[PDB]
Structures are given as structure tokens and as C-alpha cells.
Amino acid sequence: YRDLINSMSDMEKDIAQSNVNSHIQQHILVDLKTDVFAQKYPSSQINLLDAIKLPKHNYIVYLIQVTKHNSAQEPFSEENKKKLYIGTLKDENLGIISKESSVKIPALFKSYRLSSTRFVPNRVHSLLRDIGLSDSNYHSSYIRENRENDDFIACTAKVSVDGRSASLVFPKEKQ
Amino acid sequence: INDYFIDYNPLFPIFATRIAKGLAIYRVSDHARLAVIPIRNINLVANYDWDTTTGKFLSIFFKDGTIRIHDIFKDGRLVSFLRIPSTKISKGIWDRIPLRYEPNNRDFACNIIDDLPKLIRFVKDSKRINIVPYTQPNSLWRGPDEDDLDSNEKLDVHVVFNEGNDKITVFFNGDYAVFLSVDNIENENSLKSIIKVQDGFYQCFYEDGTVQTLNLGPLLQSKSSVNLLNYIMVIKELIGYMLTHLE
Amino acid sequence: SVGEKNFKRWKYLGCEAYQKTVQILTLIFVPACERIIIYVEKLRAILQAFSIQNKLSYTSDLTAVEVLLKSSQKLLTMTLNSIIGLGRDETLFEKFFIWFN
Amino acid sequence: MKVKINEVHSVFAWSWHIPSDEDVCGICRASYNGTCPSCKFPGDQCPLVIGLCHHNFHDHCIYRWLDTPTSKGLCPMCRQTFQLQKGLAINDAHVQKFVEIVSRRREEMIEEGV
Amino acid sequence: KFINQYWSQFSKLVGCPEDDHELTTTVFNCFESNFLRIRTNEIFDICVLAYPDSKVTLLELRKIMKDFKDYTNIVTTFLSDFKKYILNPSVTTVDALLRYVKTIKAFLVLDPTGRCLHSITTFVKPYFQERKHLVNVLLYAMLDLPEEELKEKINFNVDMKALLSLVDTLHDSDIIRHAMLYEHILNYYIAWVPKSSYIKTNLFEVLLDLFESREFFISEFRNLLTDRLFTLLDEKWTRCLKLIREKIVKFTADADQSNLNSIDVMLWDIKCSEELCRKMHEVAGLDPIIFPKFISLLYWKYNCDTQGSNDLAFHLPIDLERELQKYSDIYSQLKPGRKLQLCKDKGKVEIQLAFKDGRKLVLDVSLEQCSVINQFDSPNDEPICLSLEQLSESLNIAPPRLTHLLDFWIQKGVLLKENGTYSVIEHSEMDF
Ligand SMILES: [Zn+2]
Ligand SMILES: [Zn+2]
Ligand SMILES: [Zn+2]
Fold first, then answer.
1. Partner B contacted by E84 (CB < 8 A)
2. Interface partners of C (3+ CB pairs, < 8 Å)?
3. CA B36, CA B50: separation in Å to the nearest integer?
4. Does the beta carbon of B224 lie under 8 angstroms from any beta carbon of chain C?
5. Which helix (H) or strand (E) holds C28?
6. Ligand nearest to the CA of D39
7. Nearest CB to A138: which of B2, B170, B182?
8. Which of A27, B105, E30, E164 is the most buried (most CB within 10 A)?
9. Are strands D2-16 and E293-296 parallel, antiparallel or unpaired?
């Protein structure tokens, strides 16, 4: 009995691997990797940071780092600036909708890794009110854990996409 | 609570926060602890994903290749343990796809498994040998929820991405695994984020700006193809189900 | 060695060794054996259909399913042989201990 | 600084002074400071009485017991003829009541030929 | 509105006369069927949020439902929505019970019988036993206790607006002789007017249905009531106990009467204390400023007899102690066979503190706080500075407990702690 059942189990895994995987893989299409930002920015090296979908909305909000490609004829220009352009793409065909506006970073916030920024949905503003309403060791002015711990930036970037906005948080990883 | 982390549950006003002893859960309204998930090293956790369809469960991904899921409403109790054969995990997403098989006259594919009575199990306690109704090892976290009125069977898809090589692994129902080989292995670009549009349609976003789309639409639009996936899953379990009672 | 204490244990161990053995063969193996063969036949039909519906050039061989089908048929026939045999074992078991008592 | 006391609301707890897990009624098994099953309020509504035998009972418990034909006027715990202890302020209000019941039962026993 | 907007056009389309009565009646029946369907879908928000503003609609809905299938569909849809949303442990328990009782009163108005109430109750109670703090807060809601007592021993915030709202809902109470016999025998008997009950219209009984036994309920009522009498009875709780007594007696287990008896005794204890004190003041010319309460120790569950720590033998001021001893002696004379023990830890004294600057402060303080402050009473107007060790020896109070008592007077601005010695603040350099 033990031999016969194990005889079926090893043969059963063969059916799944040899045949079922063959059929399932066929009904599954993988789109080739494509560049969409090239049309809008063909002379810049593109660095991508984060992108999420707004619920009940068919638009893709993305955060990109745009660094213009410096040709071999312009020597050592100080325009090697990392620009955190924010745009929108329709979810299906990834089509650009609104003209990107470069967010001006204040000089005090230049000492943070912009690449580590992640998207945080679902009413981040609620915690801001509750932090001051709870007698915790957390102070809001910047949300700071006491006077002796790491400081993390909560960039409530008001990207007005058709009247709605998302929320961002800038983690601290000092360079 | 100050932290650059925390992901809010889309369906319920709860968040998942990270503290030293483990993953912690607090209510937004009361700031009161609800559950604690014991985790050893944060660096091992590739990412954590919430349940989009229900929000009752929570998914945790390990870099070694292990997936562990804990129910939030059960005070952080572990409910299921998953393993994927020899896979390096970079970032995983959990998606639940609800099937809608409306009755159609052109579909004469009647079912007889429902008419046949459901099986049982033999489990022996200290006092005596007892008989209990049969439940699939993974049915506890997949059973039709009491709180879910729309009890339509829910497809469970775990999507896995491998680091350093950009290999895509899709995992169905907790047992069956399917491997898909990507052609674009020339560049080792780290995947930045994974975004879900609807059920079975996913976009992957790498560091270089390239966009990769994974679509399960053809699979979900074919009634027989999903049945093939379901059938191969039932056969493997019952053979082991028999082997359990044989020993 | 045997005595009264082990004799009752011998009958109790022996009786459960057979009457519980017959239950698990009929209430588990028989319904399960039917269900595996049921699913494999539906398993065979589906792959055959897309071999025709798709008309895809590459085909997946069905020799793997038939082996499971014949093997599954073998187990169910083999299960029933044991169940009848354990029935005879029960008859032999009782007649021995009634005299051994 | 001068402290003037305007009003004092003090709380006192009263207990039975018994001339010495055994402050229970031998009949109803309720605490002396509690009520027997037939009374609602402790104290005057359920007073305690002490016998010459130094056996303690609820007024109602021992009266009812003594009123049964089977008691023969004897203490239920020790079987001596139940008479209230003299000189205890607690018994003064009940002496007449208990003399009448014991005398009545003694006369009935003489009539019943036992 | 639909008729005036479309019925003429529809009649022209069909060609039937405009005054077709049966078609209009069928249209009206379909409208009411659609209204029932929409309300069944939306009943959760109707009962949870829109109540009691939508209560009128409920009365309209009650006129329409007629079949058992309607009630079953209604209750199952409501239970699914209530269970989907409210039974979440992530929801605060106070708001959960508030919305729950709102649905109870809403459904009671909709269904006078209350059978649907039993079904929802039977389905939902295990979720109530799942939550731990429900019992404490609900009885405290039952007795309308002040938030200060709530905040003393409960470690999670409770919404005061929710508390007042549930209190308002709880107190809501909207839920010639021989010739008349011939006429009323004829008018009343010939005029044809064409699991237990557990469906009482009282919401407080439904709240009581949580407990497997009302024994714990009445015991805690006793405990809180004993605390109040010790704090001083408010008229508001007399209504509460009246409701408690009224329902229990109607039902009538052995322990239930045990905790049903002395609530009357405690009332009798205070009533006799009010009566005995007047008699005591008449006979012995006792000081009319002392109002003693004579309590039955067994029934007030005051554990005088924790036999383990020698920590409450504090000395009362000699003048007050002598007067209180006079009361004990007279009591033994009036009630022979009884001994009186002073609960030195229980009781309140109203004291007036007069300072050199003319400030008079009147406070209600415990007997312990009065003993501490009395140590600083200077008959000769000399500044009394006492160290912690001197006060502990004089008052026989342990130093940790004395610090808490001294902190009370520091918070009230009476005492100042300088370099380990406590002195009276005689001259406040700040506008009171
Ligand atoms: Zn009595
Ligand atoms: Zn005696
Ligand atoms: Zn008694």
C-alpha cells in the first residue's frame, strides 16, 4: 500500500510539472519591458523611486528622478541636479496626462536620500492630529521621537490629481 | 507614533507598525495594542502585504523563500505556514481574486462532487479515537468566512519575484507552483514597487523605469482553465490525505 | 505470562485491530479512491479538449494521466481485496479467543 | 492656621457582643450578624438569644425549633432543656416569650402520657 | 410624482384609457415592493446611523412587511452588515455597544414582538463575551457613574460624548354604578373587537441579558452603593435599584436572593442611622455636628478583618475621638448586646481652614486627611514645621502613605515642602 500510493504521488507531480505548467504558462502573457518616459524626456537619464495606484481611480502617480544626460561637449556643468518630477499615467496604456511640475526642495531637506521615499495611502493626516492628542513621547512641529532619536520627514505632498492628493514619507538614511 | 513605516489597511482603520520585538498592530482611534507578530530579524522580511479583498488576514514575506500569514483579528495568531522550493524572495504581493460563475444555459458542465457526501477524518485523542469532518490543511484560512456573506469561492494567488535575476514565480492556492522565465535578464534592475489595477492584472516597476505587466485575465476568463488548476490541487491533497491515514 | 489481565487487553487490542481496520478501509479508502478516479478522468478530458480547441502545434502527451488512471484503478481493486480478507480475519479472530477463553 | 471642624459624617459598624468559623446559627447556619431565612433585616428584626447552655441562636430559629413537637424544649445542639441565660441584656426582652413556649410544651407532654 | 411625470405618456403608448384603475393599483404595488427591497438593502445604515431620525420610516416599513421570508431576509442582511462592520475588534467597544443598543431600540420600535431581537441577540452575544471590558463599562453606564470614578481604574479612554448619548438613550422612556354594568357588560363582551417571553420592551432588561446571572450585577450595585453611602443617597440611583428590584421579583437562584436582600438592609441601615442619631442627640446632649452611620458589617462586604497589616492604626484628633467614643457607649446602652466599631478608614469631615491672611478654605476630607492637617493646628499662632519622621510617629502612619496624604494638601496649596519639612503656606503671593 505504501509503495503504490507513493507511486501515485511521484507520478502526480510529474503530471503537474510536465503538462499543467505547460498549459498554464501559455495562458499567461508577459509584456516586454518598455520605456514610456523617453518620449517626454529623451535627453535625460531616468531614475525611478516609487509609484502607486489611487483606489477608485485609473491613474498612476509616480515619482521619478530626472538627471539630464550630459553630452561629451558640455564639460562639468552644475546642472547635474536630481529633480523629483511627479506625473500621472492612465493605468491601462501608461499615457502621460498632466505636465510634470518640479517640486522645489528646501535647502534644509537636501541631506536626505530621496530614493528611499515610499508612498503611504489611506489618510496619513489622521495620525498627525492623534500624535498631538496622545500624551506619548512623540512631538510634532516634523514628527520627532524625543530629542535623541532619528528624525524622519513626512512630506504630505499635495499632488492635486483631479482634486485629490496622496501622501508621502521621507525616511532618514544620512549620506 | 513616529515612524517612516506603517501601511494602513484600505478596508479597516488599522495599521501595521514595526517595533523592536516584532510586528505590532494598533488601532488608529485608540492607539491601543491589538496584536504582536514575533519576528526575529527585520532584514529577513522582504515586505509585508495586507489582504485587499477582506483585510482580515495579513501576509509576511521572508527573503529565504518562506511565506507566513497571520490573522489580525485572532490577536496575531499564526494560521498557515508556506514554503516555496528553492526561491530567493525579493518582494512578494498577495492577491485574492473572487470568481463569479453565473449560471448559463450554454454551460451543461454539472458538478457531482457536491452531490457525493463530503469525506471525514480519523484523529485519535488520549481517551479514544474520534471522527471529525474533513477540512483541507489550508482550508482554515481559506474556508468560507462567516462574516463574508458573498461566500463565492475565492482564488488565492501569491506572486513571487526573485532578486538578482528578475525571475517571476506565481503560487496558487498554497500548494501548486508555476514558474515563468522572463526574457529580460540582461540587466539586474531591482524592482521598486508592485502595483495592482484589478484582479489578475499587475504592473511591476523596476529601478530603471521599465514597466513589466503580469496579466492573469485570460486564465480568469477561461472557466475550464481555472478548473484545471483546481483539479490538480485536489488530486495532490487526497493522495497525501490517504497517505496520512495509511501511516 | 498471559494471565487474566493481559487476556482482556489481548482481546481489546485484537478487536480494535480488526473492527477499526475495516472502518478506515471502507469509510476513507473507498470514497477517496472513487474521488481520485473521478478527478483524473475530468483531468484527462480538459487537456484533451485544449489539444483540439487551441489547435496549438505543440502537444502534451497523455501517457502520464493514463498511468495514474490504471494505477488508481489498481488501488481500488487492491483495497477491496483487503477488506474481504479482513472480514475472514475477523471470523478467525473470534473463534480463536472463544476457545482460548 | 486654625482648623475648625464644621461637620463629621462618621461610619460605624455594629456586631453582636457574644460573651466568649463558629459565628453561625446552629439552626439556620447563617452568620449571627446576618438574618435567618425568615427575616429580612438584621438586628432588631432578627435578634439573637443566648441559652443557659451558652448555645447561641436566632430568636426566630430557636423559637420555631422549640415550637415543634419533636424538640421537647431541648437545645438542638446539645439537648439540654432550653432556658434563656439570666443577666444578659440581650435576653431580657425575650424571657417571657421563651418561658411560655417551654411551659406550654411541658404541659402537652404531661397530657400525651410520655 | 411619477404619475404626473409619465403616466399620460405611458397611457398614450399603450393606448388604454388614462383612468385605468387596476393598472395604477399594480403600479402602486410595484412601487411599494421596490421601496421594501431598497429599505431591506439599506436597513443597516437606516438603523445604525439614521436612527432615530429615520424611525418614522420604520413605522411605514412595519405596515408593509407581512411574510416570514421578509423578516428572515431582513434579519440575515442586518446581521451580515452588523457582523461585517460592527463586530470587528478594531472597533472601539464603547461605540460598538452604543450602536448595538441603538439597533436594539430601533428594531424594538420596528418589531413590537421582539422575536427578531432574540435572533440578533442569540447570534451576537458570543462576540460580546469575546470582549473583556464590556461588563464593567456597561454596568457603569447602567448606574450613570461620573467619569472621575471611571478614569480611576480603567486604563483606556472612553468617549464622554458616547457616554452622555448612551445615558440619554437609557433614560429615554418613550418605549350610577348598576346601570354602567349593564352597558359595560354589553359594550365590552358583545362588541367584537376584530423560550419564554424574554421580549420585554425594557432596554435595561436586554442589557441585563448579557450576564448569565444577575448576581454579579446586583453585587456590584451593592458595592458601588456602599461606596456612595461612604462617600456621603442620590435620587437617580433610587430609580436604578427600583428597576433592578422590579424585574428580579417578577421573575421569581439561591445566591440571587442573597444579594437581593441587603440592598434593602443597607437602605434600612441608613434609615435606622438617620432615626437612631436623632434619638441619641435628644437623650444625651451629644454634639449635633457628628452624623454617624450604623452599618451591618456582613452585608456591606466591608472586609474589616484582613488580618494582615497593622498599617491603619492612625491616631484621630483627641477631641474628635472622645466625641466618637461617646457615641459607641450610648449605642451599647440603647441596643443591649451590640458593640459598635468605628470604621476609622471610612467617613468624611468638613473642615474650615482659617489662615493668617484671612483666607478661609472649606473642604470635605477623609478622617485620615483630617488627622494629618490637625497636626499643623497652631493654637498659639506659632509656625509648625514637621518632618516626615515626626508625623509618622505622631500619627502612626507609614511614611509612603503619609507622603500621598501630604501631597494632597500640597496640591490644594495648604502645605509647602521645604528641604524635607512641611510648613503651612500662610501668605499666598498670588491672587487666589
Ligand atoms: Zn430571624
Ligand atoms: Zn445548647
Ligand atoms: Zn438563625
1. yes
2. A, B
3. 15
4. yes
5. none
6. 1
7. B2
8. A27
9. parallel
Integer Rg of chain C from CA: 23
Nearest to B159 by CA among B235, B82, B91, B242: B91
D-chain residue closest to E376, CA distance = D1
Question: How far away, in angstroms, is E255 Cα from ligand 1 center?
Answer: 18
Give Cα separations from E336 to C60, D49, D63 (angstroms). 107, 12, 20
Q: What Å resolution does this PDB entry report?
A: 4.9
CA dihedral (E334, E338, E342, E346) positive or negative: negative
Query: What is the spatial distance between Cα B55 and Cα B13, in angstroms, rounded to a whole number?
Result: 10
Find cell 450610648 and name the residue.
Answer: E330
Nearest to B166 by CA among B198, B207, B200, B199: B207
Chain C residues in contact with A19 by the CB 8 A cut-off are: 47, 60-61, 64-65
- From ligand 2's centre to the CA of D15, what distance in Å? 22
Write down the residue that cell numbers 473521478 correspond to.
C38
> Cα E312 vs. chain centroid, distance in angstroms?
31
Contacts of E251 (CB under 8 A, 6+ apart): none
* B86: region left, alpha or beta (phi > 0 left; psi from -120 to 50 alpha): left
Give yes or no for C22 touching A (CB within 8 A).
no
Region of residue B70 (left: phi > 0; alpha: psi -120 to 50; beta: else): beta
Best of A22, A90, A122 to substitute, by most chain B Cβ atoms within 10 angstroms, is: A122
Under 8 Å between Cβ of E296 and E262: yes
Q: Which residues contact E381 (CB under 8 A, 6 or more apart)?
A: E356
**What is the spatial distance between Cα E110 and Cα E112, in angstroms, rounded to a whole number?**
6
Least Cα distance to A52 among A164, A167, A173, A160 occurs for: A167
Closest CA to E350 of E232, E200, E222, E210: E232
Here the contacts of E11-20 (C-beta below 8 Å, separation 24 or greater) are none
- With a CB cutoff of 8 Å and minimum separation 6, the contacts of D106 are D73
The technique is: cryo-EM
Q: List, as ranges, residues 16-45 from E with C-beta within 8 Å of D.
A: none
Interface of E with D in 110-139 (CB under 8 A): none
Beta-bridge partners for A84: A65
Q: For E255-290, give the DSSP string.
A: HHHHHHHHHHHHHHHHHHHHHHHHHHHHHH---TTB
Instruction: Identify the DSSP state of A18.
Output: I
DSSP track, A139-170: EE--EEETTTS-EEB-------BTTB---EEB
- Asked if residues B246 and C33 have their Cβ atoms less than 8 Å apart, the reply is no
Contact at 8 Å (CB) between E262 and E302? Answer: no
Rounded CA separation E265/A50 (Å): 73
Residues B80, B171: Cα–Cα separation, whole Å: 15
CB atoms within 10 A of CB E430: 5
Buried b (16+ CB within 10 A) or exposed e, C57-92: eeebebebbebbbebbeebbeebeeeeeebeeebee
Distance of alpha carbon A163 from alpha carbon E247, whole angstroms? 58
Residue A10 phi/psi, 5-degree rounding, is: -65, -40
Q: What's at B3, amino acid-wise?
A: D
Greatest CA separation for chain E: 112
Cα separation, B205 vs B187, whole angstroms: 14
Q: How far apart are CA D86 and CA D75, in angstroms?
A: 16
Q: Which helix (H) or strand (E) holds B43?
A: none
For residue E136, the tally of other CB atoms under 10 A from its CB is 13
Element (H, E) at A78: none
3-state secondary structure of D67: helix
Handedness of CA B130, B133, B134, B136 (dihedral sign): negative
